[PDB]
Amino acid sequence: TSPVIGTPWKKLNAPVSEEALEGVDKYWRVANYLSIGQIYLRSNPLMKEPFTREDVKHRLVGHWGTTPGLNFLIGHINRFIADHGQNTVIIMGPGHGGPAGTSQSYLDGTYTETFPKITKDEAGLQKFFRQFSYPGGIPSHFAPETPGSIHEGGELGYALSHAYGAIMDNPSLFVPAIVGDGEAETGPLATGWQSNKLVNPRTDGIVLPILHLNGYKIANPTILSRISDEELHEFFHGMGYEPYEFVAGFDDEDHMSIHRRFAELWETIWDEICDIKATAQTDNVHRPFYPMLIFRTPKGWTCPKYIDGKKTEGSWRSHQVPLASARDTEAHFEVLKNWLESYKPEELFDANGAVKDDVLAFMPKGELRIGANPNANGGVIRNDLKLPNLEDYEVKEVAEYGHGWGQLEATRTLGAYTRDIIKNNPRDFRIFGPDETASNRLQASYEVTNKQWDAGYISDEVDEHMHVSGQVVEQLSEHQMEGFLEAYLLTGRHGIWSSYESFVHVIDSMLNQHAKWLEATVREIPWRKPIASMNLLVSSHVWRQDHNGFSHQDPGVTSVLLNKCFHNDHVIGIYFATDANMLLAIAEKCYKSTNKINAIIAGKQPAATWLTLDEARAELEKGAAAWDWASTAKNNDEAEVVLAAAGDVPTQEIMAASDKLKELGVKFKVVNVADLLSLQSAKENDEALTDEEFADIFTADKPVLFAYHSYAHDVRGLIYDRPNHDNFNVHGYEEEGSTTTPYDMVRVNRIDRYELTAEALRMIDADKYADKIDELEKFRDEAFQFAVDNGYDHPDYTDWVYSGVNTDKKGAV
Amino acid sequence: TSPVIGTPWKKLNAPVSEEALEGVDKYWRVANYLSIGQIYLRSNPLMKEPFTREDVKHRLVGHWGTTPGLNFLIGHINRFIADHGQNTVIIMGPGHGGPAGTSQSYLDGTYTETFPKITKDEAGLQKFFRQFSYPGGIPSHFAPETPGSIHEGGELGYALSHAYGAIMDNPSLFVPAIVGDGEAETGPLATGWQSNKLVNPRTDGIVLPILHLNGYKIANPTILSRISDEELHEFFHGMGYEPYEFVAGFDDEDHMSIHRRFAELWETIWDEICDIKATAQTDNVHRPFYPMLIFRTPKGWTCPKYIDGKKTEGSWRSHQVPLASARDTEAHFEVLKNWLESYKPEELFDANGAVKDDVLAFMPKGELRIGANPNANGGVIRNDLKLPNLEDYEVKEVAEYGHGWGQLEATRTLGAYTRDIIKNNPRDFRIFGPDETASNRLQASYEVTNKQWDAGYISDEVDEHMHVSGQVVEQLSEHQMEGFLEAYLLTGRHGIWSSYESFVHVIDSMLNQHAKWLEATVREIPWRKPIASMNLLVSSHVWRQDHNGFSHQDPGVTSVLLNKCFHNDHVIGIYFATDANMLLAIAEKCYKSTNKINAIIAGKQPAATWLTLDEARAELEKGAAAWDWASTAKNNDEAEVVLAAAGDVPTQEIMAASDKLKELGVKFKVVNVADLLSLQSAKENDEALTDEEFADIFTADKPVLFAYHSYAHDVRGLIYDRPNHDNFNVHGYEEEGSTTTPYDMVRVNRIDRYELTAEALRMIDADKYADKIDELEKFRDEAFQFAVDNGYDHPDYTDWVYSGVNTDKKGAV
Numbered sequence A, B: 001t002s003p004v005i006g007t008p009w010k011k012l013n014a015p016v017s018e019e020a021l022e023g024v025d026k027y028w029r030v031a032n033y034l035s036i037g038q039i040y041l042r043s044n045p046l047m048k049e050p051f052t053r054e055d056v057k058h059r060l061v062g063h064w065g066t067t068p069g070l071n072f073l074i075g076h077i078n079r080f081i082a083d084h085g086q087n088t089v090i091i092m093g094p095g096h097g098g099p100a101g102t103s104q105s106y107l108d109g110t111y112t113e114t115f116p117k118i119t120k121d122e123a124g125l126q127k128f129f130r131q132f133s134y135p136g137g138i139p140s141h142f143a144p145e146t147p148g149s150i151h152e153g154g155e156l157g158y159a160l161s162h163a164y165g166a167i168m169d170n171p172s173l174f175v176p177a178i179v180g181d182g183e184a185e186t187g188p189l190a191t192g193w194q195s196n197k198l199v200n201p202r203t204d205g206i207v208l209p210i211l212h213l214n215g216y217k218i219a220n221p222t223i224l225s226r227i228s229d230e231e232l233h234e235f236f237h238g239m240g241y242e243p244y245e246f247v248a249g250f251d252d253e254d255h256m257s258i259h260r261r262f263a264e265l266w267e268t269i270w271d272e273i274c275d276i277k278a279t280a281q282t283d284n285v286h287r288p289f290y291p292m293l294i295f296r297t298p299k300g301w302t303c304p305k306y307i308d309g310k311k312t313e314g315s316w317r318s319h320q321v322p323l324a325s326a327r328d329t330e331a332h333f334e335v336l337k338n339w340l341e342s343y344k345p346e347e348l349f350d351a352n353g354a355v356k357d358d359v360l361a362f363m364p365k366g367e368l369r370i371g372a373n374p375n376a377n378g379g380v381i382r383n384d385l386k387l388p389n390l391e392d393y394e395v396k397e398v399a400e401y402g403h404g405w406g407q408l409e410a411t412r413t414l415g416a417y418t419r420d421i422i423k424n425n426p427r428d429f430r431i432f433g434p435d436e437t438a439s440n441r442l443q444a445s446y447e448v449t450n451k452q453w454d455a456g457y458i459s460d461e462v463d464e465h466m467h468v469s470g471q472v473v474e475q476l477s478e479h480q481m482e483g484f485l486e487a488y489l490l491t492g493r494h495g496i497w498s499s500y501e502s503f504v505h506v507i508d509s510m511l512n513q514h515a516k517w518l519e520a521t522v523r524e525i526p527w528r529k530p531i532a533s534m535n536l537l538v539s540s541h542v543w544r545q546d547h548n549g550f551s552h553q554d555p556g557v558t559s560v561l562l563n564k565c566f567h568n569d570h571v572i573g574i575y576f577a578t579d580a581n582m583l584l585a586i587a588e589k590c591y592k593s594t595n596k597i598n599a600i601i602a603g604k605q606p607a608a609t610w611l612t613l614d615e616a617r618a619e620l621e622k623g624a625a626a627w628d629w630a631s632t633a634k635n636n637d638e639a640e641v642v643l644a645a646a647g648d649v650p651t652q653e654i655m656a657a658s659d660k661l662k663e664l665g666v667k668f669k670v671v672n673v674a675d676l677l678s679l680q681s682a683k684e685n686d687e688a689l690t691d692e693e694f695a696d697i698f699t700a701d702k703p704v705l706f707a708y709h710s711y712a713h714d715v716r717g718l719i720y721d722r723p724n725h726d727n728f729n730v731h732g733y734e735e736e737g738s739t740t741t742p743y744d745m746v747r748v749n750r751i752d753r754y755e756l757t758a759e760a761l762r763m764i765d766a767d768k769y770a771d772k773i774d775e776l777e778k779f780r781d782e783a784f785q786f787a788v789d790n791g792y793d794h795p796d797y798t799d800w801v802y803s804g805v806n807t808d809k810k811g812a813v
Ligand SMILES: Cc1ncc(C[n+]2csc(CCOP(=O)(O)OP(=O)(O)O)c2C)c(N)n1
Pocket: A065, A066, A094, A096, A154, A155, A156, A157, A179, A180, A181, A182, A183, A184, A186, A212, A214, A215, A216, A217, A218, A222, A299, A319, B434, B435, B476, B500, B503, B506
């Protein structure tokens, strides 16, 4: 569970010292100066004579606008951390403000501790300034390469769901979440404000949202800066906050005076947080109004007010570079030089180029430093889950009654296994669900915990399995669920979420950002220790969207995830739970894994169980397997066709086609694929099947009928250099279906058992089996018309039980 | 331009008549009866003796919970439309309340007009009940197959961006937008409330958001129903609404009394809307507080209160079916029978099984009916745009200086063309951007229009090109931009939006829903006429994300769009603008198209122009072409290698590699691909290249080096059955890059000009070209060291001009 760090939720009980605040102003001055140097300066970081256009970067890249306001907040937050001993992680929503977070880490000393070549002297500063957004150097954003970051803020919107995930089961943590006012325009951010109804102030930490109301985005004003101030406070109050508002920088108020006003507001806010935390030790059943700060300052604060007659400070024009180039003209260079001198760096750095002791005496120390706090590198907190014995959850009936036994709903087995994970690991594992945890059948967890709910309660007739603290959280928002789990992982904990397959797409771009975080981490950030994997049960899938139809039919998250499988990063798993025992084999592997996104595609509908647990774990190891017990062919050379499947429903249809083919005396081999990436080119992926193993499973030269859960294009793109790839006939989802029967869903996508029997026969010998093909094609129409006449499927389809099941016996019928 | 329909914004000036209200209660009762019949009954719709379990559907599919609340609001909306002659489209947020939208259309008489077999008598009604969510019947949701729908509501979240897009430039239209309280938990819905700062009450219509606060989602209460009522009102007021609340159904109040209170509230709300509209004719520069309605009623309203001892009315338990089976026991069947009787259908239908005249005398007639209004079938409003002459925008320099001339920023040309489309079609065409309109270089439109902004103004030094009415809209939300445009198309108008390439994935699931909407329509909804296409400029793309790095590098919308290319639907366009002339060629074609989603991938960075407009149109017709002026091989059999490209940057790299291969004496053919689906299997796609045309462009047997803009997996899966596909060496984006130089971006993805020259030589004869290959690989290293050392790219990379340009002539370089 999360460490208790420092002395949490302690009041100052004294005014902030004049000396601490002179410190904060020096910090702000040197952070701004560092921030400008990074964007503008390729050499001569301290402007030693002569300081010339020659010292300016050729391509100016970086964002000034947000930066001075981030520097101001971070200096004040550092002062606060130090005075109070407060366990603090920031979330920099405007992550394009990267130079604010690298400057922080440089100033707190974690930069040089982590990057020993970047030294606390003039030569380290020259390197520091040059490498920023520079080839061979470091990103423009508050990237994973920077100590103190758990949130890059490149794709906007996710600041609040990450802040709130972070504080979950983390009662000593405080998260100042800085939210851009443009970012507050996004849908994910807008809903993220409401997270305060889903945390508990005794058993979780505290989020202080800070709206960075600097009044502009790239080329527009922001909605929230331009509505009435009274509508702005009502909005936040309506969302369960106590809004406080600070305005500064719009007139000639001297900076010390601003710091004094701000530190005093900050302490009042903090007193209120401390009251909330103390009350919560006694009463954590009535939701408080949590403070939030409206921080209203001019965008680009402290840069030149006007440049070439254009308003710059306090404008969208300051967004990127306020001085657009300083290499082109003498006069532009001069504006740059005067801007950098305005911070009076000769008072901030010693003759050696180190920042002075009196600039940083106010800073926190040790693990309370923003860049050093372990919650910002949660891999160092994460330990292996204590897992229950996998064998305890096995579907034992395959071993007793045969392959293909039963009508289990597979995800219930993951339900029972996860419940015992939670029991063994209280406070370290969460489930999230956009109002679908019971619908995906994970509700066995309610035997040991509850849905966490901190809005009103009204009656034991409707409020079941909810309590103000619990390890399951639901809100109808894929953004919140994904974001909450991401940050729970990044702070060193574990969990799973589930979603209807088609709506996983709502968060494709979040999956992309988390994959890229992981890709960068495993490639070049070895100090950022492995975090637990983001595990996503993809269920209520395409083939069985019973109550819903066409808009709910989209298994293409497979396609999106394939765009993050390069370079042997291994940060993606794509799995098809063939049945419940395969689902156990996949879950155990994913729950042990670290630094991945695992999509575990599994059916919640009644279905056959194909494999014993031992057989599933053996299959999963390579990722695909022949099923000798299912094949009529004695070896590869004798197979007339390969019947291959990935997905619980494709496997069902392939299995049923295999019984029909057996009846016709066909010789064939059955293959099952459970890990999509086992099929990937062996030269791109050093964990995939070797060309030799692949040819052994699929044959060097027989026709391969492959029934795929998602879009056929996935498999086609993947196997393009594999032996025998030209003999693959890949069937998959084809954008057909509606509100219908199970048979009809497979029929209209050409993947039903009958069509599969026909296809195999056409691939073997079309003229010879022409009458058999024609009669299967007619039966497809007879079975559809049966569904239309009757409202349920043909008994040939529903009553089929694989020939492998002992239907002579007890409870096998 | 939108039709002015009826007599808009008129007050009643009298109480609603007791008679109109008895009609509303009857509508409510018979719509409830029709909704239950659809969910539960396969025959005997009027419960004629004997009425038994045999009349009940074997599989109960559908959603009751939201439905009686929808039916109530719709009866009352129907009374209001009749009484006022008000041009009205509803948005059904809880689109799973399909039975209400179908019930509505059956009642207003549109269903029988559109579906003549579904008659208004017993036999028609039996068919109506049976077909609902049933194999061979109609969907579970308010699908495009329903008259009156322009919003399915399958994936929740979009009710409000659609409502607001629908009213833009549509000053007589009124949109009651019904939003689920669960749906309001989603990111996209939460930011949609803010659209009231982006519309104008004189030049646009009026949305009335109606929060369907029934207290539950699937398995949970809802946040907004369980916070204090005082917070609920502050929240809506802080977002610029005047909130009004109605509560009913929680006690024994009789129904007529509920209807009287509601009609009175509705008229008061309406009078405030009429005042807002009348004031707006005089003062439209001060934003009003727009009414919204909080409609708080028990979920499942009017179903049995308890079933089997469980609370059902006023519970999440009523979400799907409140009575889970009505075939299993006599007792359950009996509950269904009593629930059906409780509406007294013996008073609602005549002996013929037609709904009686007194039930519906209060209803609206003609084009004002919810099902008949042309805004709910915008294709009948849409006319072709008046396009300016394409040749006016041509980059003429190619014709004068040669292929490869210049350093134009291609999207500026589209910007100029779009400016004059707006000028020629004022009030009929819009540009949307998530704060990226000027960034993607579409700003020439500000010469004929302005960004629409209805929040505060402060100063002409920051407020440029903004006006309270205008044809460009920006908010930093891809869900808002896509949603506004969708509904602007669905109501018969035109436009375009632009996005950074990587952040298109934010709205992948909106693209999916809209593509499924177009798929169902082109397949089987001939009466829903063609709407203009959803055109998306995808720019600031992966190869040139200069200010930004790795989070901004993801061209994978291509891969998402390929999952919607089946069945010859032709609802997807995927285009690569090779240069500004191809961009013109693509745009013209997109702007003329209907019933599509067009992705237009185009570069905003400085780049060569390859083609004349005539050549670009010619290539685009077929989608791919050989470039004979660029080839050294005289015909195919003499080609040593084919150099193929898709995308402006791949084309640039290929062309520079081709100048290098010329110098080495190599004989090669150069191919360009502008339309990705030109490559699709000719069995799947009847507009694709036939295999002959394909083999003729790509050769039947020579090596094919293909530089692709996006992920290589796309192209490989597409061409899996094409002749010569095994000889394709496809390079594309590979999840590498950071904040770095143009050359470094292509190098690290193995698609730079030097690596491509090397791959070409490896493919022809690795041993003969060993030295040259080795020299090319050393130079990739040297060109990167030069970027690290200097901060900009090697003059060999930077200074290259295609040998096809006449550099002798004065203005060519
Ligand atoms: C989802 C998403 N869309 C678009 C962008 C492009 N973008 C980068 S910065 C920015 C403006 C951000 O403004 P704000 O949230 O106000 O930050 P600030 O004024 O502090 O720099 C935009 C639109 C993005 N980064 N993320």
